[PDB]
Structure of 3-deoxy-D-arabino-heptulosonate-7-phosphate (DAHP) synthase:
Amino acid sequence: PIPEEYDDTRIMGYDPLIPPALLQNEIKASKKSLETVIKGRVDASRIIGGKDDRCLVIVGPCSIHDPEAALEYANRLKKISEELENDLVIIMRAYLEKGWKGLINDPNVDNSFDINKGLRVSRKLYADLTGAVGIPIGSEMLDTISPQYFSDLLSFGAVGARTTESQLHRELASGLSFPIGFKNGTDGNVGVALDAVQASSKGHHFMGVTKNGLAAITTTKGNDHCFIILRGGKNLTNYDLQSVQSAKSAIAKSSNPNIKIMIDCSHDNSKKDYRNQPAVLEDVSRQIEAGENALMGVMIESNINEGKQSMALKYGVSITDSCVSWDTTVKMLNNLARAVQKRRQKNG
Amino acid sequence: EEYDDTRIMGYDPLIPPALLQNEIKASKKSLETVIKGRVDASRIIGGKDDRCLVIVGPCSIHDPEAALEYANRLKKISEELENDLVIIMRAYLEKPRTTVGWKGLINDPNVDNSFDINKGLRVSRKLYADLTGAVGIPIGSEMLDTISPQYFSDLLSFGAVGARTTESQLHRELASGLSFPIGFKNGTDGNVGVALDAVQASSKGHHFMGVTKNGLAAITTTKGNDHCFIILRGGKNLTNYDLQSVQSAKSAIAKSSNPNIKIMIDCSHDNSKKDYRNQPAVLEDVSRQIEAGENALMGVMIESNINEGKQSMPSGNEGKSALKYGVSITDSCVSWDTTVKMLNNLARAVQKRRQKNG
Ligand SMILES: N[C@@H](Cc1ccc(O)cc1)C(=O)O
Ligand SMILES: N[C@@H](Cc1ccc(O)cc1)C(=O)O
Ligand SMILES: [Cl-]
């Protein structure tokens, strides 16, 4: 006789989720939303596959905390996306979590926990970005259960530096309906990202849930639309030319010698300082301007206002990591858009 | 549906975990073996017992009949060396990563390139109940996802997080809510810092997406796991079982938030250059630092079987009839006779360290 002190000894409690098929029906994806989602996946895939000379730009706040502040940011970002449509493909970074447990964990930013209210707030936000304004969005892929609530509204997915080697995330990447980007290792390792791209191109079996919320094993087809992201190491930056050449050499000896490179301009490449973000973009832009076709895009941590605060809170200011201003951002995107114009001039 | 599940071929609903636990009930003696294995370990992680925690067994269990004979052998020697060693059997149901060959007991229980997850879950769970109950040996597994542990956690005494998942926040959250000690292996480049960071993160409460006991999607609230440690395992082209590497980690633990983190050495995998013949030489070195006085060494990890070497099973004869008995079909293990030499030398090691602490 053992009094169930062998099971869930470290589980404070379970909070059952709303079934994804029901959340997808309560907050439905409008036709204009799915039009934006499919267009974002196709436009990004053409740049990844080498069929388009434009640059894929993943720009947005490090984390989304205020839905109304993010919806006003997207209206600014969709305007500039239409003006630079000939050279840039802009996908807004709509990350839900990284002080702040996230939008799915805490919708009211008051340190509570309402996982169901978080899913409705995050999905209705996703439905408004792709529908009300009409801009493609991308999120971070954290587990094998959350994507079942947002996959019909996502056009891009990122696997962080600390999960690129995770076999579970490589399996899930093989079953996601949008292009995936693998960041290099936390020490600057490029090889682990090439291994992730190759592994995710194969069919796999991962443990997820059905649309009704039932534990089930999933059979995947493989994701042939993947790329690597250079975000630097804990002690190094790899956005410079010698580092791109080092990555280009590693790709040439891999199983996918057509892999293109995206450069994170924030995080460790900018020493976590937003003022170095424009100077980092100038370097990669000049590499592109010289005619480097292996360079595919960039990542920009931008916001309505530059800087970072804590959690009575400033409007349009990030709460996590560090962002650049909007007046800064439009210059970064304009300077990059000219570099893309100069690249295809050398390709003519 | 040109936008949803465009790369999903099909779902296979799982039997609810409570139903499997009702079909393959955990015996009273099974549970008694599980709880004792957990506390026996934890006392070594916390520095309350100078014994050595041994995680020994095959790389993957493809033959339940062969595993049951190995466990009875392991149970006999574990009782002989109970004064010095705490032995937990390796009962890994899945070889991860590399796609060539077998896919694990869960996905392929018949060992013939099949897919039968519900039949594999019944076979795997029954094997766990027989090891903990019929023979009565603690067992440990690899923590791969946040759904499968709900099927075996009531029968597990130890969990392992691979080198490719130590940095993953998802597996750090899961470790914070598991009912047994967890061991984090260093990075695939030999980096020990990510292992200390994982042990620290898993000591706090977290939230992770899992399933209820009936297989329904739910978010969990964890209490925090303070029975975690690091596993020195090696790098892509290096070994870290030597005296230089152990003390580098020991000084790194000294600057962590908990200087009581003990070190376990993986005697196989990259520390043996994926060679079963180098496992005794690696353990012999580990045994010496233990016997010279080093209390930071808490245990070892050995890949062992009834017979040494390896084999393959992919084509031709259509299954188990062409396999050798007690030979692993993944990686490479030492024979049982070698394992007896290895455990007996490590036992005398724990003895002479105990004399140096009086
Ligand atoms: N619906 C997801 C695929 C998926 C399936 C099951 C999961 O558990 C997670 C994701 C997509 O279209 O991308
Ligand atoms: N039941 C597990 C904890 C757990 C909970 C939910 C899961 O989805 C997975 C694992 C244990 O006691 O160790
Ligand atoms: Cl958390």
Summary: Chain B touches chain A through 72 residues (CB under 8 Å). The CA atoms of residues 22 and 104 of chain B lie 24 Å apart.
